């Protein structure tokens, strides 16, 4: 499965409640949920870069599949997790070990759609991106 490419947000479902489970204050939840970030992904063997781009903040992930790393979520919920992103078939599975239970996410492709399900303490956000070519 190859996530490389540029992706534009199409839907973002239940993001504010996901952020509330992360204890993001209400004012910042509304700022964040107005945003419609793009994703720019380069998959280079097991080395993956996922850039989440917005006018408010760019959040960059840069990691090796299968290897645990210290993920610095400053500027988001201001926590740090020990994170591992691994192949589960044609799905990319992320586990973020930390203060919060059941924190992680799942990423996969359907057609020209990138699907992202983000989870924490049973709360679930679903996002869908379309593959785009204007860069
Ligand atoms: C909440 C975890 N981040 C990373 C998502 N992700 C999943 C796999 C790789 N990254 C999701 C996300 N952050 C964001 C941004 C963001 C920034 C300030 C807050 C309080 C919330 C969200 C705005 C656009 C980029 C930063 N928008 O969505």
CATH of the domain at 41: 2.40.128.20
Joined together, the tokens standing for residue 101 give: 């239970």
- Using only the alpha carbons of the chain, give its radius of gyration: 14
Question: Is 34 close to ligand 1, i.e. is its CB under 6 Å away?
Answer: no
80 vs 42: CA distance, rounded Å = 24
* Total number of domains in the chain: 1
| Residue ranges in the chain assigned as alpha helix (H) | 15-21, 26-34
64 is in an annotated binding site: no
Domain range spanning residue 29? 5-132
Joined together, the tokens standing for residue 61 give: 């992930």
Q: How many CB atoms lie within 10 A of CB 87?
A: 12
* The CA-based dihedral angle spanning residues 19, 15, 101, 83, taken in that order and rounded to the nearest 10 degrees: -90
Pocket test for ligand 1, best of 3, 74, 76 (most atoms within 8 A of CB): 76
CB 104 within 8 A of CB 93: yes
CB 33 within 8 A of CB 12: yes
From which experimental method does this structure derive? Answer: X-ray
CB 124 within 8 A of CB 103: no
**Which has the closest alpha carbon to 34: 53, 16, 60, 51?**
16
Scanning the structure block, which residue is given the tokens 């586990």? 95
Question: Is 26 close to ligand 1, i.e. is its CB under 6 Å away?
Answer: no
107 is in an annotated binding site: yes
Residue 81 Cα to ligand 1 middle (Å): 14
């Amino acid at each position: 499965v190859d996530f490389t490419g540029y992706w534009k947000m199409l839907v973002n479902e239940n993001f504010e409640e996901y952020l509330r489970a992360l204890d993001v204050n209400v004012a910042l939840r509304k700022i964040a949920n107005l945003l419609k970030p793009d994703k720019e992904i380069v998959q280079d063997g097991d080395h993956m870069i996922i850039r989440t781009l917005s006018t408010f903040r760019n959040y960059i992930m840069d990691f090796q599949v299968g290897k645990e790393f210290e993920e610095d979520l400053t500027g988001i919920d201001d926590r740090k997790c020990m994170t591992t992103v691994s192949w589960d078939g044609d799905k990319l599975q992320c586990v973020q070990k930390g203060e919060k239970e059941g924190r992680g996410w799942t990423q996969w492709i359907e057609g020209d759609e990138l699907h992202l399900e983000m989870r924490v303490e049973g709360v679930v956000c679903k996002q869908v991106f379309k593959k785009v070519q204007h860069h």
